[PDB]
Subunit: 92 residues, 6 copies
């Protein structure tokens, strides 16, 4: 929801406390979290074959991917939203 | 539209070329641009009396305000999105 | 003192060690720390009704507020100084 | 050379003066500049099918691409190095 | 004054308009601007031989130096405050 | 190696896990890590008397210094690469 979407655009320390709040915020709707993990791969390595390059949607996937890596690590990491681009915004 | 909303979240050089592309993107719908200028003052000086503090909505107002200041200046300025806050995202 | 004032302008990981060093640096003078907490709310939600908007003073309040939130949390957070603004520096 | 490689890692205002200094620095060796433009597309959209993801090499391509866009625009833009990633540095 | 001191801590586009406002703000007191240029050299290359390493004072010198380079160039540049350091703040 | 060199250019949370991966990456070659610690002092305080100011080499020293401070502290810190400078890249 809002919490996750707005958090995906921030730079923050991803730790147990933060992982809990953001991961919970995307438990519902159900398929929500898995869709963002499916799109991370496209948005990161196969951006060329994408007829939708929403920056917010990209950020949500970058955060989802980060929560996932943390769920298999427990090691705190600095989360950073994906690089913005004014030339990318003017081109759709 | 998307261009403006996505641009409001970037850090870029606001010059004539950029002012034209972003200002045009918010000519329609009509009241769009004026609403963002009305909300800028609330989001900046009267945040306390607001039962809606969407970060994206805040960014759109910060950019609208920037385009306005540029329309009465012609002097290029570095645009920067408003400060993010993970504690603000977890608090509604 | 200097340590706190200079720290309020940095981006750092606020943890127990750092909380101890900065909170100690503002134990004296006595009313120092409480004044910065009183001003945080003005600088954040009631900026309009303020005939003094010193950026350094704003940063000191943002840090004081951060130390306070940490004293009731123990959870490490990334501290970030408040958004700067060249248009704010030229306007008094 | 050094100037371009080191500049590709900085955040600066790309204008005529800067375009001249950096573009000149990559006139020699000859194929240098064209190779960086060929690699930009891979790094940006086809990163998945790439058995070499040097961050410095990525930055050089991002800057080359920026000089190119400027050569067909004359409009000053803020240049920003590509997003860094500690998780990308530990994975080769 | 305040304008210059507060500006020295911001990231902004240094152009004719901005150069005029900030350079004027340090015309008085008289020796003000020249002292900051004398200290830039120490703060940048001879930091070791300094019994005073105030970050704000360092920023003021970095900005003074920037205004000077601009006075002999007319070419707009992105100004950036000097790197902050929490380990530098805790050590005086 | 690549891991350390590329990491020295990133902004990340330096913790036990990260300290282990980066410190290991510079165990070999042998004198590697000690040379970067010797150069840190020059780059930070005696930059003036230095006929080699490679930014990457500077970053490697800033990271080496950070790993060292962490080896005698165990307290997680946010690592930040040294301030970049386009005016420094055009001057060798
Ligand atoms: Na939800
Ligand atoms: Na529109
Ligand atoms: Na004190
Ligand atoms: Na060359
Ligand atoms: Na890599
Ligand atoms: Na003055
Ligand atoms: Na090695
Ligand atoms: Na250099």
């Amino acid at each position: 929801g809002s919490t996750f979407e707005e958090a995906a655009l921030c730079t923050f320390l991803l730790n147990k406390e933060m992982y809990l709040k953001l991961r919970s915020d995307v438990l519902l709707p159900l398929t929500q979290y898995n869709r963002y993990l499916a799109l991370y791969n496209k948005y990161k390595y196969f951006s060329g074959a994408m007829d939708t390059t929403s920056y917010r949607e990209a950020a949500c996937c970058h955060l989802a991917k980060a929560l996932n890596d943390f769920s298999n690590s427990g090691s705190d990491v600095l989360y950073q939203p994906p690089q913005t681009s004014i030339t990318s915004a003017v081109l759709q």
